[PDB]
Amino acid sequence: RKPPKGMFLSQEDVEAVSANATAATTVLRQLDMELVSVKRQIQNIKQTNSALKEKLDGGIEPYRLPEVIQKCNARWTTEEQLLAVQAIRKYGRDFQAISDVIGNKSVVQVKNFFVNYRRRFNIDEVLQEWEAE
Amino acid sequence: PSGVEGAAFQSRLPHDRMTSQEAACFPDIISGPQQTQKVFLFIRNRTLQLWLDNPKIQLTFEATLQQLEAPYNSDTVLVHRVHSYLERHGLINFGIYKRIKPLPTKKTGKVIIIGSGVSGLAAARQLQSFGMDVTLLEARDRVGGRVATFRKGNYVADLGAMVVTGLGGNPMAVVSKQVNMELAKIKQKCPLYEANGQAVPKEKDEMVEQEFNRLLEATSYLSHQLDFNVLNNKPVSLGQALEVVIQLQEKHVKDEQIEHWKKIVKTQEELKELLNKMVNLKEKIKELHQQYKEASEVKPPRDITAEFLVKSKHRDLTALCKEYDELAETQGKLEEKLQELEANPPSDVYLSSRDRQILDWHFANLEFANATPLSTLSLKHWDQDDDFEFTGSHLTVRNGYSCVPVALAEGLDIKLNTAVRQVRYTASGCEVIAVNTRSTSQTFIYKCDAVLCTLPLGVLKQQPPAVQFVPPLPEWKTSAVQRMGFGNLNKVVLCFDRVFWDPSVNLFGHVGSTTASRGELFLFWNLYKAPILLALVAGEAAGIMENISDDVIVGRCLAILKGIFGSSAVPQPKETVVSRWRADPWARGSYSYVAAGSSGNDYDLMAQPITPGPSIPGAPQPIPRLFFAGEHTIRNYPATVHGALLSGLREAGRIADQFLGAMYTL
């Protein structure tokens, strides 16, 4: 019913090795080369990737800044307000960035800000111009 | 099996069905009631059982009805009919028995038998057993034909048939009780030895071998499951398919190397696009950090815009620093996936030189127990006789298989050194024309009612004809002769003065330099008590080692033995015998194979007896004058002694039916 397991005999396979006298020796060169071809393209990209691996020498570690583990407050200091209004002009709705810029305002205090103050800080005008951009 | 049923199987008949032959003799029973069939079927089995349980004396009808018990020893013609049918077609009282009823007073009808080979002798005995004038014509100075034993001093070695496929339903089992043969078993263990001189280690021995049995089935799947059976309007040979299977394997070894190194690239090229994304983040980060530094050099107190600049560039540089960490977290997982795929690299080869050279020896063994290059065996039919093989360990005859033809020949009119030269058969009889082999001038004419021809298929194949048929053999029979396979394999007999081989080892191989000489001296037997090693030569090689002197051949043998047992430990042979079966004009080969284009059904034509045209035109259609038996004639047991023997018993049973009449069918 089925070939002895480990033997590959497909209907399609068979007609290709019997289509003529050397259709056997044909098919096993367009494979034999096929390989040498992919084998080449390996050592190429294995090299392209060896040079890219060395440009990343050092990694990003003469470039890190330590952690601002600053405790999340409640009041909107007249300073923190102003950092916010620019945070919107530069960041729009990313509510995460705004809350990392101000540092001591949870993302949700950033909502109340967006609404409580809006009009007084024209958060509409400010936001629409972030979109031009 | 065992019982009444044990006989039925040891006699090659199904204990619970009427056979197509028995239907034709007892067509009252088989058309009638299930009861009577079972009655009959016991009486058959029961009588078979008696003959088998004592095959050294004839089983008279009286003796049988005696040991029958009712309701079966009730109908004393159903017992008669059964017995006579059995006795007629050699299912009982065949071989060598003491005859309780000594031979008939006067002979009836005259039969000339061409060939005292085994089939000949077996029918001659059965015909003379039935009271006919049987005389056998033999071109040789000995009986047996293909059963040749060499004897010099204490040395004994068959150049002929040697093995006895197991006595599980073998008529030879019956014979061996009747003739004192020394049946030793064949201890199947065979160590192989490459052209160096050293054994192939179990390791390979078994993984080659299994790949070889695996390739075979694969062809059988090509044949029966896919119908790979014609290749540009020629039929497909076994050796053909055995390479379109070996190629499809070498091919898939490559398809699989390919789609694995193709897994590597498809991921190594993901690394190429992650390393590029990483280096262009180390560039954005290298530069933000510079910006952020510049924004902190502003010495405070600063206004809010230049304070939002620090706080901003800080989140921007922490955001990019997060990206670049993730994107070398991912560089982590891929960079090891890729020693992963370089550490399960699928197989380098299908087979090595050392590999498909040992496999070449496992092909030279097919070329031995088929006697032909696998490129000529029919794919669909090569093995068609397998379904019928006798259950038992194969055996060897230690006193020489020739003990069995000689035993049969006894009591028979045998004209030795008599080359039959022309068979003439007509509406009213036949005459056979022979010469004396020694002075070929001296001519012999033999007249008879029927000629049984056991001429080896190789002889029948000769162009131009060793034996002329008058009238010619009809096309349906001549074409069945061309289509069928006749093959070759030869034996070299090495007689020494001391065993220098492993004496518990019956046989040991030798692997071949080439593909093209997988046959040449590919296997050795220590089968005999004496120091006699016996060297097979099958395959394509057999046919060409007949063009090489006996010396050159013993040389090639000793060399192959020196390498395997030590340049010094292998003396000279005292006596050497090189067979030449394709040479030998009374055989023109060794036995039949099923050629590509033959089926097993040519083997059945081979037997259809020949009926000549009417003498006086518009006469009654005559009684059939020319008959055939021999190894080539028996579909289900070709190329064997038991098979020839069986064909002899057969034709005798049919000739007797033709000329003595068939009383057992009312």
Tab-separated table of N, CA and C in Angstrom, chain B residues 13-90:
chain	number	residue	atom	x	y	z
B	13	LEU	N	-1.616	-30.064	-1.689
B	13	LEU	CA	-3.035	-29.885	-2.004
B	13	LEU	C	-3.812	-29.311	-0.824
B	14	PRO	N	-4.750	-28.395	-1.070
B	14	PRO	CA	-5.520	-27.786	0.030
B	14	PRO	C	-6.525	-28.772	0.608
B	15	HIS	N	-6.338	-29.156	1.884
B	15	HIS	CA	-7.092	-30.238	2.534
B	15	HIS	C	-8.609	-30.056	2.598
B	16	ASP	N	-9.134	-28.902	2.176
B	16	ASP	CA	-10.554	-28.614	2.353
B	16	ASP	C	-11.191	-27.983	1.121
B	17	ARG	N	-10.586	-28.159	-0.047
B	17	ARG	CA	-11.115	-27.731	-1.334
B	17	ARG	C	-10.783	-28.818	-2.352
B	18	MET	N	-11.667	-29.025	-3.320
B	18	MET	CA	-11.286	-29.879	-4.435
B	18	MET	C	-10.460	-29.030	-5.402
B	19	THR	N	-9.302	-29.571	-5.862
B	19	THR	CA	-8.414	-28.846	-6.784
B	19	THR	C	-8.990	-28.876	-8.193
B	20	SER	N	-8.571	-27.914	-9.015
B	20	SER	CA	-9.071	-27.859	-10.390
B	20	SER	C	-8.870	-29.179	-11.142
B	21	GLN	N	-7.767	-29.888	-10.865
B	21	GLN	CA	-7.551	-31.216	-11.437
B	21	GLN	C	-8.588	-32.228	-10.948
B	22	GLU	N	-8.765	-32.328	-9.635
B	22	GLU	CA	-9.751	-33.250	-9.089
B	22	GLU	C	-11.158	-32.927	-9.560
B	23	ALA	N	-11.455	-31.660	-9.826
B	23	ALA	CA	-12.753	-31.339	-10.403
B	23	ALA	C	-12.914	-32.015	-11.751
B	24	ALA	N	-11.845	-32.050	-12.535
B	24	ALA	CA	-11.979	-32.586	-13.873
B	24	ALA	C	-12.109	-34.099	-13.875
B	25	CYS	N	-11.559	-34.782	-12.876
B	25	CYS	CA	-11.769	-36.218	-12.765
B	25	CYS	C	-13.015	-36.586	-11.978
B	26	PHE	N	-13.415	-35.784	-11.018
B	26	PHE	CA	-14.556	-36.175	-10.208
B	26	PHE	C	-15.674	-35.148	-10.366
B	27	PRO	N	-16.032	-34.761	-11.595
B	27	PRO	CA	-16.990	-33.666	-11.767
B	27	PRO	C	-18.398	-34.047	-11.422
B	28	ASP	N	-18.615	-35.267	-10.951
B	28	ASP	CA	-19.869	-35.570	-10.280
B	28	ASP	C	-19.836	-35.027	-8.857
B	29	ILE	N	-18.710	-35.220	-8.168
B	29	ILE	CA	-18.621	-34.877	-6.756
B	29	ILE	C	-18.658	-33.364	-6.554
B	30	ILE	N	-17.753	-32.644	-7.222
B	30	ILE	CA	-17.628	-31.208	-7.047
B	30	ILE	C	-18.860	-30.435	-7.485
B	31	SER	N	-19.748	-31.010	-8.284
B	31	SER	CA	-20.949	-30.275	-8.662
B	31	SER	C	-22.114	-30.581	-7.744
B	32	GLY	N	-21.935	-31.561	-6.866
B	32	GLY	CA	-23.016	-32.122	-6.120
B	32	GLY	C	-23.097	-31.529	-4.742
B	33	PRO	N	-23.200	-32.392	-3.758
B	33	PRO	CA	-23.569	-31.943	-2.416
B	33	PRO	C	-22.343	-31.743	-1.548
B	34	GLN	N	-22.369	-30.690	-0.718
B	34	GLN	CA	-21.224	-30.366	0.130
B	34	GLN	C	-20.798	-31.563	0.963
B	35	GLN	N	-21.746	-32.450	1.262
B	35	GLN	CA	-21.440	-33.652	2.019
B	35	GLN	C	-20.447	-34.527	1.267
B	36	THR	N	-20.786	-34.888	0.023
B	36	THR	CA	-19.958	-35.825	-0.733
B	36	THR	C	-18.566	-35.269	-0.991
B	37	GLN	N	-18.458	-33.958	-1.256
B	37	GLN	CA	-17.139	-33.337	-1.377
B	37	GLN	C	-16.303	-33.590	-0.134
B	38	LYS	N	-16.924	-33.524	1.040
B	38	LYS	CA	-16.152	-33.700	2.261
B	38	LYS	C	-15.784	-35.167	2.468
B	39	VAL	N	-16.706	-36.075	2.133
B	39	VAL	CA	-16.412	-37.503	2.088
B	39	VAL	C	-15.137	-37.686	1.281
B	40	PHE	N	-15.247	-37.393	-0.014
B	40	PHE	CA	-14.138	-37.485	-0.952
B	40	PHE	C	-12.861	-36.889	-0.384
B	41	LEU	N	-12.952	-35.631	0.051
B	41	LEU	CA	-11.782	-34.894	0.498
B	41	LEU	C	-11.067	-35.603	1.635
B	42	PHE	N	-11.803	-36.313	2.504
B	42	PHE	CA	-11.142	-37.155	3.503
B	42	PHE	C	-10.439	-38.337	2.836
B	43	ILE	N	-11.134	-39.016	1.930
B	43	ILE	CA	-10.574	-40.233	1.369
B	43	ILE	C	-9.268	-39.914	0.657
B	44	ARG	N	-9.238	-38.779	-0.051
B	44	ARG	CA	-8.018	-38.283	-0.685
B	44	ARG	C	-6.917	-38.053	0.340
B	45	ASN	N	-7.193	-37.178	1.321
B	45	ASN	CA	-6.223	-36.866	2.365
B	45	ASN	C	-5.767	-38.130	3.059
B	46	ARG	N	-6.725	-38.986	3.410
B	46	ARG	CA	-6.407	-40.183	4.170
B	46	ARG	C	-5.420	-41.067	3.414
B	47	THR	N	-5.623	-41.233	2.101
B	47	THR	CA	-4.761	-42.120	1.320
B	47	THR	C	-3.387	-41.500	1.120
B	48	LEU	N	-3.364	-40.204	0.780
B	48	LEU	CA	-2.118	-39.462	0.777
B	48	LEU	C	-1.354	-39.722	2.063
B	49	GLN	N	-2.071	-39.707	3.196
B	49	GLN	CA	-1.443	-39.903	4.499
B	49	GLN	C	-0.797	-41.273	4.591
B	50	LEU	N	-1.468	-42.307	4.086
B	50	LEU	CA	-0.882	-43.639	4.152
B	50	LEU	C	0.382	-43.723	3.316
B	51	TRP	N	0.305	-43.297	2.051
B	51	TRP	CA	1.481	-43.389	1.195
B	51	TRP	C	2.642	-42.639	1.811
B	52	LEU	N	2.365	-41.446	2.329
B	52	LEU	CA	3.423	-40.615	2.876
B	52	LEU	C	4.058	-41.270	4.091
B	53	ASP	N	3.231	-41.879	4.952
B	53	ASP	CA	3.699	-42.438	6.219
B	53	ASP	C	4.513	-43.708	6.033
B	54	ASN	N	4.478	-44.293	4.840
B	54	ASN	CA	5.383	-45.382	4.490
B	54	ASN	C	5.604	-45.326	2.989
B	55	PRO	N	6.611	-44.587	2.545
B	55	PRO	CA	6.865	-44.455	1.110
B	55	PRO	C	7.852	-45.464	0.556
B	56	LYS	N	8.197	-46.520	1.282
B	56	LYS	CA	9.113	-47.481	0.690
B	56	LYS	C	8.415	-48.714	0.115
B	57	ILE	N	7.090	-48.836	0.276
B	57	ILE	CA	6.323	-49.909	-0.351
B	57	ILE	C	5.090	-49.322	-1.023
B	58	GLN	N	4.693	-49.943	-2.132
B	58	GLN	CA	3.505	-49.512	-2.854
B	58	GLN	C	2.261	-49.560	-1.965
B	59	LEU	N	1.334	-48.642	-2.215
B	59	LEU	CA	0.049	-48.611	-1.523
B	59	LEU	C	-1.033	-49.119	-2.463
B	60	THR	N	-1.254	-50.432	-2.438
B	60	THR	CA	-2.321	-51.052	-3.213
B	60	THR	C	-3.677	-50.525	-2.780
B	61	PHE	N	-4.647	-50.656	-3.679
B	61	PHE	CA	-6.011	-50.247	-3.359
B	61	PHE	C	-6.557	-51.058	-2.193
B	62	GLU	N	-6.281	-52.361	-2.190
B	62	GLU	CA	-6.710	-53.224	-1.098
B	62	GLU	C	-6.203	-52.686	0.233
B	63	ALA	N	-4.897	-52.388	0.297
B	63	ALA	CA	-4.290	-51.879	1.523
B	63	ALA	C	-4.993	-50.628	2.027
B	64	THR	N	-5.510	-49.807	1.116
B	64	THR	CA	-6.116	-48.543	1.506
B	64	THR	C	-7.516	-48.742	2.073
B	65	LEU	N	-8.362	-49.470	1.348
B	65	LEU	CA	-9.716	-49.705	1.830
B	65	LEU	C	-9.698	-50.440	3.158
B	66	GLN	N	-8.698	-51.297	3.360
B	66	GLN	CA	-8.417	-51.909	4.651
B	66	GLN	C	-8.328	-50.965	5.849
B	67	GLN	N	-7.503	-49.918	5.729
B	67	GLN	CA	-7.237	-49.009	6.837
B	67	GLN	C	-8.248	-47.877	6.816
B	68	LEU	N	-9.116	-47.805	5.820
B	68	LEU	CA	-10.245	-46.904	5.927
B	68	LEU	C	-11.267	-47.424	6.933
B	69	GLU	N	-11.969	-46.479	7.564
B	69	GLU	CA	-13.044	-46.752	8.512
B	69	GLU	C	-14.307	-46.044	8.041
B	70	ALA	N	-15.465	-46.681	8.265
B	70	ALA	CA	-16.731	-46.159	7.763
B	70	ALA	C	-17.039	-44.803	8.399
B	71	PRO	N	-17.901	-43.984	7.766
B	71	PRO	CA	-18.691	-44.165	6.537
B	71	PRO	C	-17.874	-44.089	5.236
B	72	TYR	N	-16.546	-43.997	5.364
B	72	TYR	CA	-15.658	-43.745	4.230
B	72	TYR	C	-15.250	-45.021	3.512
B	73	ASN	N	-14.986	-46.112	4.246
B	73	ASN	CA	-14.808	-47.424	3.629
B	73	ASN	C	-16.242	-47.938	3.603
B	74	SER	N	-17.111	-47.265	2.852
B	74	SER	CA	-18.477	-47.726	2.625
B	74	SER	C	-18.545	-47.799	1.096
B	75	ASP	N	-18.434	-46.652	0.420
B	75	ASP	CA	-18.567	-46.587	-1.038
B	75	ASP	C	-17.248	-47.048	-1.646
B	76	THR	N	-17.200	-48.289	-2.131
B	76	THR	CA	-15.939	-48.888	-2.546
B	76	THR	C	-15.638	-48.684	-4.025
B	77	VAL	N	-16.195	-47.646	-4.646
B	77	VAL	CA	-15.649	-47.098	-5.878
B	77	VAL	C	-15.169	-45.661	-5.693
B	78	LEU	N	-15.882	-44.864	-4.890
B	78	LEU	CA	-15.309	-43.600	-4.447
B	78	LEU	C	-13.933	-43.811	-3.836
B	79	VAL	N	-13.709	-44.948	-3.182
B	79	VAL	CA	-12.359	-45.246	-2.740
B	79	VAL	C	-11.509	-45.679	-3.913
B	80	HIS	N	-12.054	-46.518	-4.796
B	80	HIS	CA	-11.306	-46.937	-5.982
B	80	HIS	C	-10.888	-45.739	-6.823
B	81	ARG	N	-11.873	-44.978	-7.320
B	81	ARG	CA	-11.598	-43.808	-8.153
B	81	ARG	C	-10.511	-42.928	-7.544
B	82	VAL	N	-10.684	-42.558	-6.268
B	82	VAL	CA	-9.698	-41.744	-5.566
B	82	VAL	C	-8.316	-42.384	-5.636
B	83	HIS	N	-8.207	-43.660	-5.263
B	83	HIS	CA	-6.890	-44.283	-5.249
B	83	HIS	C	-6.236	-44.209	-6.613
B	84	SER	N	-6.953	-44.624	-7.653
B	84	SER	CA	-6.334	-44.706	-8.967
B	84	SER	C	-5.881	-43.334	-9.459
B	85	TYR	N	-6.736	-42.312	-9.314
B	85	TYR	CA	-6.334	-40.933	-9.603
B	85	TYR	C	-5.027	-40.579	-8.895
B	86	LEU	N	-4.969	-40.841	-7.593
B	86	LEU	CA	-3.747	-40.600	-6.839
B	86	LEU	C	-2.566	-41.321	-7.465
B	87	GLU	N	-2.718	-42.620	-7.723
B	87	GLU	CA	-1.605	-43.426	-8.225
B	87	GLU	C	-1.199	-43.013	-9.630
B	88	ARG	N	-2.166	-42.519	-10.400
B	88	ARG	CA	-1.929	-42.152	-11.786
B	88	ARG	C	-1.060	-40.911	-11.867
B	89	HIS	N	-1.432	-39.867	-11.139
B	89	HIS	CA	-0.678	-38.632	-11.234
B	89	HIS	C	0.400	-38.526	-10.184
B	90	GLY	N	1.004	-39.648	-9.807
B	90	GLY	CA	2.150	-39.662	-8.907
B	90	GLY	C	1.976	-38.902	-7.608
